[PDB]
Amino acid sequence: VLQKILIGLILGAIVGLILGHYGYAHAVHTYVKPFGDLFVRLLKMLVMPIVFASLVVGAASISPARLGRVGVKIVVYYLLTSAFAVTLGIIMARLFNPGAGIHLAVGGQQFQPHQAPPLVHILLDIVPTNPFGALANGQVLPTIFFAIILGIAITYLMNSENEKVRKSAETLLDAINGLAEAMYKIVNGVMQYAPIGVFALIAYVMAEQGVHVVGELAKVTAAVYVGLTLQILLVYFVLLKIYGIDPISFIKHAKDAMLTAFVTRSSSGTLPVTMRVAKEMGISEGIYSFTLPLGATINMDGTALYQGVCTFFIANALGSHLTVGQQLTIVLTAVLASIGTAGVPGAGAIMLAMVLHSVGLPLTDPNVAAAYAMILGIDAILDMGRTMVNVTGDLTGTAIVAKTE
Amino acid sequence: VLQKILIGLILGAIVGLILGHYGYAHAVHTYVKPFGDLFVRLLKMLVMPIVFASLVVGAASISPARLGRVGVKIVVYYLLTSAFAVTLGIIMARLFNPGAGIHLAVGGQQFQPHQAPPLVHILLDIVPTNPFGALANGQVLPTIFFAIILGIAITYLMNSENEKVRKSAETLLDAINGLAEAMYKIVNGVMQYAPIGVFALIAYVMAEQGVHVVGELAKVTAAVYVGLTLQILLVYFVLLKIYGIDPISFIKHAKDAMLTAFVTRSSSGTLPVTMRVAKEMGISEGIYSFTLPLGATINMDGTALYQGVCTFFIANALGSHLTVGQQLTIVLTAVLASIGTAGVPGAGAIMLAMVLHSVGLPLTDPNVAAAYAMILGIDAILDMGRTMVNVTGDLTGTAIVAKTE
Amino acid sequence: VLQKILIGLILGAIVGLILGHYGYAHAVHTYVKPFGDLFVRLLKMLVMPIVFASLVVGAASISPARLGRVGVKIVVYYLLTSAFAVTLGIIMARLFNPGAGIHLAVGGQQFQPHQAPPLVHILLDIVPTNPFGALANGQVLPTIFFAIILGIAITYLMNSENEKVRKSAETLLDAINGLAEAMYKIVNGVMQYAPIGVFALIAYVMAEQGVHVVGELAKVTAAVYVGLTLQILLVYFVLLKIYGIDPISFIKHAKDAMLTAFVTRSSSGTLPVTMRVAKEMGISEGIYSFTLPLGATINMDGTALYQGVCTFFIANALGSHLTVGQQLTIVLTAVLASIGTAGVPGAGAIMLAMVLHSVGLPLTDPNVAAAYAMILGIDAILDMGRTMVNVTGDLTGTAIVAKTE
């Protein structure tokens, strides 16, 4: 499996890259990308039962602390891993270069989605209004919430005086587990397609946007991937070791999701695999159940590091000192944008504006707008990497709060 | 419990009221309404499983009569309680006078709701086309219907020749009961937040519309509340007592629903609590499972009483003789719009036009428009009261048909 | 039933027919059609749970072959039965004649549906993106797919070394079967309404379009019906008989679905009755569970026949030679459109264009557009017949792939 995917990944990225230089970009998109979609598709499909079932059951564990404790632990873990990652980006963007060379074609045309939901209508939006609707619409947040409340609820019912009560409660709680179980059985079968999918998936990415990783972009591309590489070593290997956990047992188990998350670019779409991985490394369904999903949307260290290295790239190709010292605002805003950024195909660059405006350079004065347009050119490239470091870091922390609680 | 809420209630009312007389209305809203929202959120959530689950189970009771009997009983009980209520509000509107004080500013703007669905595509719309969708979209009517057809079906399945058919039936039927059971477990938990919720809720209501209970409205305001008051004494207590049931054990057990319905204003959103109260006083799940939901949308004695007093208020501020003798039309159309009115936040005043134009005064002729416009200024206040009489009345007739059948 | 359904259909088709010849069409439509709608509503209701549940369960049978084998078989079966039907239409439309009587009214108006989703965005669209969304949205295909994958997934879970895995698996698998079981109990119940519905339903159709089946249209009408009849004897009996299964016993056991489908016109909405008929003749729930739905959208021998007799009707009123020899284009295109045509109210006529344009005469050349607009007059008439030969042949194919595999 891991060799058939790697065989696919490598020979793919190569087969792609050739065609992009021979001008077959469009022809890879009309013939190859679908085979790679059937994969992204066949994954998205498991996201909803798997997440749901494996968390109502996931209130197996001790309500008050376990969950509550595990939560407070991984939330603090998430925030720090995020904040650090942008700092490591901020620096990486100094060492390796963004780009001082002047951006040509002024006026790229970048729209203003200022109608950005008020923070209150987001936090309040975390409580479902129809667990069923929320359930049948994606919405892997309220769905998380309702699962927990339903789980905790089921647990209490089993400690009841009545024999009736605890019986029907265990019928349901079992049935829900049937699903939970049945779902992984699938994540496995539909993982076998991953080779073809992976190959076909990058065949597009490279033959469409790789054939442009040159100029100052090449510097940035590299300025990001190196920044990324370090985030794994300097942060995940470093925090794993001190936490009594084997870095090679880690990055060999999670070697499955690690890749899916890189070819798909959908952190959220990778969730079924990410969750099989956590399960297939013996973590309690009370941890990986409320950590990976809550994290498949909060912890985006990779995106944050990317947001840092990108604030400088526009600050350079614009001509500011990046408000030296007050680039701790970037450190902050990029942590705030991390949370927000949604784990869909490629919306980190979109949610990158909030940070850009915080350093002082809005997406409207067409110098900033036309420089941004260049970043968006090398984005299928940039994302892959960060959308790994995004899923990896969520496991790193599941593995921590694993041993811990 | 009832005290923690009562403390919050009275104290909130005062806190609000004062802030509204100092000009802090927009600050309560931006700050305090969300705590009251989180409450309504947390309830709206349980509305869908609770209704579904506790009704498939609800087909424990004897298919033919019980349901078929209890049904026809509670509809007659409902229609009359609604008719009585508007008559009682017409009386209450002649005695306590609405207001012959000539309408002020001419320019209210009220578009015509003529596109009010045909009765055909309303009755037929009671049969769901996708129980799963009807299930996952609110729609607590077709959902009611399916639940019963599912139950009754699960009932026949147990009396089967095969032991497998009867086994699986009892699996499902049980699992379903898990949810239902589990869902009340939450009604009790989420009930604990209510004090903070309640306080936060009226805090807004009063410091936004309470600080406007003046002019002719103050009369109408009171003209309505005194009517509502009687509707509890003269009808509910009187019809409770006569059927061999204790009015004080009633208002003692149903104290919870009554209040949540008063602050929420959501008759429908109060359904979980209301349904716990029904079970928390021993009505069989074969009755409160099909009376309260079907009642949270048909029986709205309060709205009809509020719809009575309000047709006159415009007949007074317009100079119409309230079409003496032919005000039996209000009596009818209000019983007809009662039904129609949906237990959402505040649509009694909207569904009022059906009754208004039936009396002769159309919502288009600027005089009526500008009359209506004032009533709608003091609505949060006006609604709270009738929202109570609305939930209350559903319990009353469920308590009647409790003893009867 | 059987005779009350027949008594309703016969007297109804007449009661209708009469009112039309006197001018009351619209009245039949305001008072009668609703009863015949409450039937179609009461069927459509069970198409979603009956389909899903009777197929997760339907992964009773041997994963590898059985399914796969059964699958490859029915598809070849369908593709041949379809292709034959049209050929049988072409012929039937050469012997019986469309019309050499020149189209009159030029000025009918037909908007070009050039936006016809690509075959790729249809085939990838067969895999759900949220089984729950697709569950709650019709989508009796994505849902078919996810069922099989959750069924097969559950089977393996049952042969698990753990006892926990195999317990919760059989709890779930049972709960699902409960519904599947319950859902047939209903199809029986709401099948009793059938005579009322049937009666009311042809009452409309006849008294609104029957009183128009005259002239070259009456010829066409007969040409399509004589053609359909022949598709039944010459292909269904003659293909049942050869495969060793009694025709009279087949067209006796499926006289139920056979009729609902003729009065409903919705092959898709008839499904629950079609599935009960399958079960009630003893086909394994692992065949009729994945042959009938994946047939209520792909196998439409009826539509296809009607598509050949129509492509001929136009090239006659228009005066072409129907591209003689190359009407095997139609033969092909029709089978291709048959698949596409989806078993809803009356859209075979809509999807007819693709065949027409392939033959040569597009729907926008105001001549063709006016011939076609006549065909669309006697449509629910033509539809009834082909919406039978449509379902009938979806069983015939399950009756073969029953015996064989």
XYZ file of C-alpha atoms in Angstrom, chain A residues 120 124-125 127-133 145-146 149-150 153-154 157 164 168-169 171-172, chain B residues 34 38 41-42 44-45 48-49 135-138 171 174-175 177-179 181-183 186:
44
model
C -20.641 35.737 18.060
C -23.279 30.424 18.758
C -23.362 28.625 15.393
C -24.825 24.570 18.592
C -26.888 22.658 16.012
C -30.564 23.496 15.514
C -31.333 20.214 13.817
C -28.740 17.616 14.674
C -30.179 15.793 11.715
C -29.776 18.686 9.321
C -21.116 18.899 19.603
C -24.345 16.883 19.261
C -24.033 15.563 24.164
C -25.667 12.355 22.814
C -26.472 11.264 27.468
C -26.312 7.585 26.583
C -28.919 6.015 30.699
C -35.715 -1.330 30.132
C -32.744 0.123 24.710
C -29.898 2.572 25.437
C -29.272 -1.307 21.629
C -28.796 2.173 20.136
C -26.618 35.892 23.001
C -27.543 29.988 23.542
C -30.205 27.186 20.593
C -29.686 24.395 23.066
C -34.089 23.862 19.305
C -31.577 21.043 19.102
C -36.192 16.922 16.349
C -35.074 13.592 17.880
C -36.881 14.734 9.546
C -33.809 16.871 8.721
C -35.482 20.210 8.042
C -37.716 20.999 11.022
C -34.104 -4.013 17.920
C -35.622 -0.244 21.205
C -32.797 1.724 19.572
C -36.314 4.481 22.434
C -32.694 4.921 23.315
C -32.667 8.306 21.587
C -34.788 8.326 26.532
C -31.421 9.958 25.930
C -33.129 13.108 24.662
C -30.616 16.338 27.972
